[model samples]
Target: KLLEFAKSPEVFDWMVKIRRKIHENPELGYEELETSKLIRSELELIGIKYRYPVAITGVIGYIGTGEPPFVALRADMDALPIQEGVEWEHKSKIAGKMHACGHDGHVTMLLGAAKILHEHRHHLQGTVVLIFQPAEEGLSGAKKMREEGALKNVEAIFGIHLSARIPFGKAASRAGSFLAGAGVFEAVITGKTIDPVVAASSIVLSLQQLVSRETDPLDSKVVTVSKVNPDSITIGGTLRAFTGFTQLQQRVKEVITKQAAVHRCNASVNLTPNGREPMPPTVNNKDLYKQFKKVVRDLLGQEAFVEAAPVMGSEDFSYFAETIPGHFSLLGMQDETNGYASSHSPLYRINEDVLPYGAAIHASMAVQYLKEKAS
Candidate 1:
């Protein structure tokens, strides 16, 4: 089971070592040459192929058969100018710079997932792309990755943030609109079988991201399948729009059933999956939410979950999630026994013990997703 891979006796040792490796050498956004250097070195050590210098110091490591049903696990790596305030050994060596926001843990988690996935790569059907991003603290690092074909054939992406608010050893995330305010979407899936998964996901996919063309940001229309049937392939989704829901709705419905027919499968669209009302454009896929919530509970135990409320903070992960469904979760490290500081604070104390849980979530989300959609 995935649980053993994360919490096994010595796993945390390796996880913490990687975490400290990043912590000591804190690098700023777009200037993470050495950070990526460390990452690139690890991929080679792990014997996996990857593309480097992406989005400037971002690394995308590939594992598994070079095929479809791509699922991504992302880790944001960016330090700040805060004079780090932790006194334990393995503190930041770079003066006037630090990993106070737990990005070091993010980097370590993604790398740890690589270790898990690669060892079990034989069990996976398609590729699991581990995205190590740069400048997550409001620097459009994710958007840059999006622009540079990071999610080219990717079906879904998962990002985890380490937080000081949630109780230590627990994970929390809401289903939809976890973050707010974003923008166009045309999914041109040519080769058929788009998998009822892909075909229907594409419908909801069109609305999750933004473009520079026509319509005000407020005038955007977004849609996604709330219901997808694998046996015969049926779909149910919501349409969110500030204006023209009627014409846009019908036009969307037209293209969908037509798409299904083209694939030689009859299709129908249901806009009222929620009692005839369309949800907002910013919701996470309920199906993925199920997988996400289900995975943590199973791997980490039912006690590990904390139903989360949506945060109004803006996220660049939306850029990837818009094109491909995104499931973002928070890893809580708030324990009264451990004197921890709030996130974005100079003295924020990261419970290194929580490393395995994050790595477990990253590994579990991708593996579980592929298994469910497998046949």
Candidate 2:
């Protein structure tokens, strides 16, 4: 029943237009002025009241009666700093900025769900908080929102990411550790007579042992040296692990210092200095996961739901999950017949066909949760 509402041709057309409009004019983190304005305009059109400027650019709207047992649905609104590489009519107009991460699609889906619920507010038993967050790309937007009371009085929260790797119209999430905690670390190695590059290379090689030899084989961990520069050999990369981040951190420091000493290089390691702290793994609550799975199955059939393994990617949505029960899901948006690229890539583009499914999931989950709680 909810599926039919989200799949309407008219609804799809409306959301596609909105999604494209935002895609063309991309905005960076905490600078989402026009994007937030667009969201406020849509909320006004839907006759919903909203508060804005949370976290400098976040927006929040409310639906249903102003009552207890509120449920929240979140969509990020920030664009990556990458230039749009895909050739399309809706390609980004702003150079050096792009919606490569499918955040524009996320906003469209949440708004689409808002439209559905607004049209049927009579059936809603409790409040629904519509959260449009800013600065999700490598910034702790979700954490900022929580600090500003965005999740106040909220019983549970839900969010989704459009995955270019997954097939369209399908959804996946796991009950514990859906995604890894991530943080950046950079090292500066200065060597006497020894080449800095060579010293950095030695450090990188030894860092690999932190994962291959130190960590449990069954447990997942990654320490990649993504950057190496000639200026005193600047080495930096991200670390991802479901658990044992502390162990990994300890090992990383030990290996870098020991390897630098062995190579006769002066080394200093900085972990996420001036950058966002490590985002906690997106751990879905078991009870919330069970409830969400039922909603997905009921709306999209049993085959539409897939049990996903933990992803190494990190998300700020972990902040919400840590505060209250939350479930972060991946909505498949790739159709292989048509070329597709992963998020953060210049060529990345979302499959619009899956927009309705995402919207339906957002709306159905909130509606069902409220209805179930009332019963």
Candidate 3:
């Protein structure tokens, strides 16, 4: 079985070591030069063919017959700007950069899958593209990789994100709309030749009214953070909407329009990506989820599967999914014994035992994807 292969001393230990090395030397988006180098060097030893610098420090490794019916697997390679405070040998070497989101584990899982896939390349039903992407934190690295043709000739792409939301030995994802669409709103209010600070401040508190009244507790909304200037009071933060960004667009506009009207000030809102064009919610293709479900049940069994609770966090994986069928899954790493710390925190820790589980699943899905396609 693929899990047996991943659990072997060689594969398991190799993954842990590789994970720690990257964890210690964490890098940010478009800046994973050394990280990319380490990956390429390993690919050489594994005898897997790959292309480097696909999207600035991204490595695309190839396996199997490199013909038609390509399937891709992805791992984000960027670290968060947060610093690790944990007193561990693998704590980030960089002061302010940390692998708080388990991207280090992500890369290791894909690499772990790559190795297992390569050893059995002759039996592979189709080619597999290993995606090592950069700058997933705030930057849209997944979008960039797609622009560079990371999904070229690929039938489908699959990805996994280690999560604290679920317990170890489990994996979760929903059939559609697993994550929210997110966009930043920077609304600057200016009175008719007057200081609009109070109006701006009022608008800040009012945006939450959407959540308090218009939404359930689980369907959260947002606005405003520590940003301020004198003349024009600027209120800005992100919008996490699940139902429909279409509905989201109207509601927020209403709040800004009437809320600011009470103070005789004008409110200008930018619903862009802190710039332009926010990320769409990550949606799993319904048909693809059937394939994914069979893979998980067959490989890890019924106990390992769960319906993932949709989160407000957005992912650029939406880009690839928009073009080709894609599935982004949450692989659990939580353990009450180790203190299940949430991601984007300095205290967050990864359960190494889950590495092989991800590896096995990653390989199993591609194997099944093409096995069905070949017929």
Q: Which model scores highest in lDDT?
A: 2
lDDT of 1 by residue, 249-306 (tens): 6666667766655555555455444233332234466788889889989987888888
lDDT of 2 by residue, 104-128 (tens): 9999999999999998887799889
Instruction: Please identify model 2 stretches exceeding 4 Å from their true place.
Output: 186-205, 213-218, 225-237, 254-272, 336-338
In candidate 3, which residue ranges exceed 4 Å CA deviation?
Answer: 191-202, 212-220, 223-233, 258-267, 336-338
Write the residue-wise lDDT of candidate 3 on 238-286 in tens digits.
Answer: 6666656656766776787777788888888776634567677778988
Which 10-residue span in candidate 1 carries the lowest summed lDDT? 182-191
What is candidate 1's local distance difference test score? 0.75
Error of 3 at 259 (Å): 4.6
The deviation in Å at residue 115 for candidate 3 is 1.1
Q: What order do you get sorting by TM-score, best first?
A: 3, 2, 1
TM-score, candidate 2, is 0.86
